[PDB]
Amino acid sequence: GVKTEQEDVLAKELEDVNKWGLHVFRIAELSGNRPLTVIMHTIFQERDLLKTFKIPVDTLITYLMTLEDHYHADVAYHNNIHAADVVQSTHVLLSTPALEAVFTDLEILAAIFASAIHDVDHPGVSNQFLINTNSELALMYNDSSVLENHHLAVGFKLLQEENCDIFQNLTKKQRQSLRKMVIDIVLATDMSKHMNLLADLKTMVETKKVTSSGVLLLDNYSDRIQVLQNMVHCADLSNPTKPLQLYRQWTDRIMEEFFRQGDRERERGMEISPMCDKHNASVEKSQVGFIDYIVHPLWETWADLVHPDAQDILDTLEDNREWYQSTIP
């Protein structure tokens, strides 16, 4: 009834679960490619979610193994490691001092479940690709947030798998509320929603009210869900805020995926996609553009909302940006 040595080496890495820049690739290795399951299980136990939602532990493991196995191992970026990373990054953002005791357990379960399922069964190509190839998914979702709609439908459908209904003890009221929030969060991961989300977060920072403590006040669904939507969106776009050893691994992976969409886009023609070309397409400028135009304005606005909790994260992003800038020949 004691851990194996590999289980123990894994238990020791998972002690970093509450820290920005967890060695997520190492956890993936030590767990036998089970990062999503071991990280979700650790977070559920730490936030006491099994007792609060009366989730049988074997049901939780069954669902999490099932969920992880619906991520594609043959997709370099949008796989179970990315899922694990966004789960663990959302977990750290939820622990930020500016949000202490703001969110209910159901809101916490929604953000973490949303993060776990947010890219499930990703085929490793974009919405535009699926629309332009006349793919079944694009036809199913009438070309609207195609992948995001699929990730939701899969994440929920998997609850019907033998001993996979982790929500089996929630009331109808709990499940309707949980489901709506989970849908709202994942749909918000569609990049076509980024500018509207960032605008609403900027509006929120301008109108920012604060409580008896230094803790944010959010007194309506609109505001509560907007913060959770932008939190998970920040987690999803958190790669350039990580130590460079991590960021670089993620960039290689997104480039493999993008170059391979690039490869398929050539013999199919439709025309190549924003800097998705191993030829006239440079990695270092693509990262500096991404940080300047998307990641920095998002993480700066987030940093404003929870000031000063996100200072170290924003610094790491600015160093990483200066790093990629410096490497441009």
Ligand SMILES: COc1ccccc1COc1cc(C2=NN(C3CCCCCC3)C(=O)C2(C)C)ccc1OC
């Ligand atoms: C112009 O930037 C890029 C061009 C080509 C290769 C890579 C990039 C930036 O590197 C990353 C990009 C993304 C994404 N970017 N996008 C798309 C892509 C096209 C336009 C840029 C934003 C919208 C996404 O949906 C995700 C979240 C997968 C995620 C992690 C990245 O690095 C770790």
Ligand SMILES: [Mg+2]
């Ligand atoms: Mg996605």
Ligand SMILES: [Zn+2]
């Ligand atoms: Zn994602």
